């Protein structure tokens, strides 16, 4: 369980990562134990054996946020006559969340 490089499946680790990262953006309460663990799994994926899962992680979080803003853009688009209050409603939940995700992906 040490931080030595090791072979780790990407689907299971991403799925366990997907729960918290879905709440890191679009701010929500996340458990203390999760934040410590969800930073460890990033090291375990970028230092994966025998090939680092950094290209996969970068292109899967990008496609994760691809399905986030697009799903968020639909809600703002259908909210006619109140786009300004809705745009800032999610921007404060995203711009801080973007720094929140940048905080998690430091390594």
Partner 1 sequence: EWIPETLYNTAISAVVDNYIRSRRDIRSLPENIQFDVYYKLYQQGRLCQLGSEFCELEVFAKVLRALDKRHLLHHCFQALMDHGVKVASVLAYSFSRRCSYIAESDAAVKEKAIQVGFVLGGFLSDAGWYSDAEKVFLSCLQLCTLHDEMLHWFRAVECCVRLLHVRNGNCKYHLGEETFKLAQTYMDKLSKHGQQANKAALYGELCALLFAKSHYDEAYKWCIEAMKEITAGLPVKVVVDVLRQASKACVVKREFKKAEQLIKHAVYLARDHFGSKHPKYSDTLLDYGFYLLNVDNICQSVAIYQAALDIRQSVFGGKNIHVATAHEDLAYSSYVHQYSSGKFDNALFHAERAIGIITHILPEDHLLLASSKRVKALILEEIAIDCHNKETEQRLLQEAHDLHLSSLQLAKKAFGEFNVQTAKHYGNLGRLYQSMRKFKEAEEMHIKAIQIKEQLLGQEDYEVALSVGHLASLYNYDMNQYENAEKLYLRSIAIGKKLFGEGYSGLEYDYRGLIKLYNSIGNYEKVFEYHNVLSNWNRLRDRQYSVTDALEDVSTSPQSTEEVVQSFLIS
Partner 2 sequence: DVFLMIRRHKTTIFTDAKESSTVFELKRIVEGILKRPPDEQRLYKDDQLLDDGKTLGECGFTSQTARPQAPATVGLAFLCIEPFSSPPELPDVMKPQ
Partner 3 sequence: MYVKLISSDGHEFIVKREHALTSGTIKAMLSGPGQFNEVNFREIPSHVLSKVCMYFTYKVRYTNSSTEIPEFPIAPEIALELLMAANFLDC
Determine, following the binding rule CB under 8 A, whether residue 5 of this chain makes contact with partner 1: yes
Residue-wise burial string across 34-61, b where 16 or more C-beta atoms lie within 10 A, e elsewhere: eeeebbebbebbbbbeeeebeeebeebb
Q: Is residue 4 within the footprint of partner 1 (CB under 8 A)? A: yes
Taking CB under 8 A as the rule, does residue 6 contact partner 2? yes
Residue 106's alpha-carbon distances to 27, 40, 99, in angstroms, are 19, 11, 10
33 counts as binding partner 3 under rule CB under 8 A: yes
CB of 35 to partner 1, least distance (A): 23
Q: Which two three-digit tokens encode residue 47?
A: 């230092």
Binding residues for partner 2, rule CB under 8 A, total: 5
Q: Which stretch binds partner 3 (CB under 8 A): 10-18, 59-67, 75-83, 95-103?
A: 95-103
- Does 47 interact with partner 1 (rule: CB under 8 A)? yes
The residue among 6 and 88 lying less far from partner 2, judged by its C-beta, is 6
């Amino acid at each position: 369980t040490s931080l030595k490089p090791r072979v780790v499946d990407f689907d299971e680790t991403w799925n366990k990562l997907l729960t918290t990262i879905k709440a890191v953006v679009m701010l929500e309460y996340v458990e203390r134990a999760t934040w410590n663990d969800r930073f460890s799994d990033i090291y375990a994926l970028c230092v994966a054996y025998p090939e680092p899962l950094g290209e996969r992680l970068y292109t899967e979080t990008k496609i994760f946020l691809e399905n986030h803003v697009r799903h968020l853009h639909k809600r703002v688009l259908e909210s006619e006559e109140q786009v300004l209050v809705m745009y800032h409603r999610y921007w404060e939940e995203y711009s801080k969340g973007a720094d929140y995700m940048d905080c998690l992906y430091r390594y």
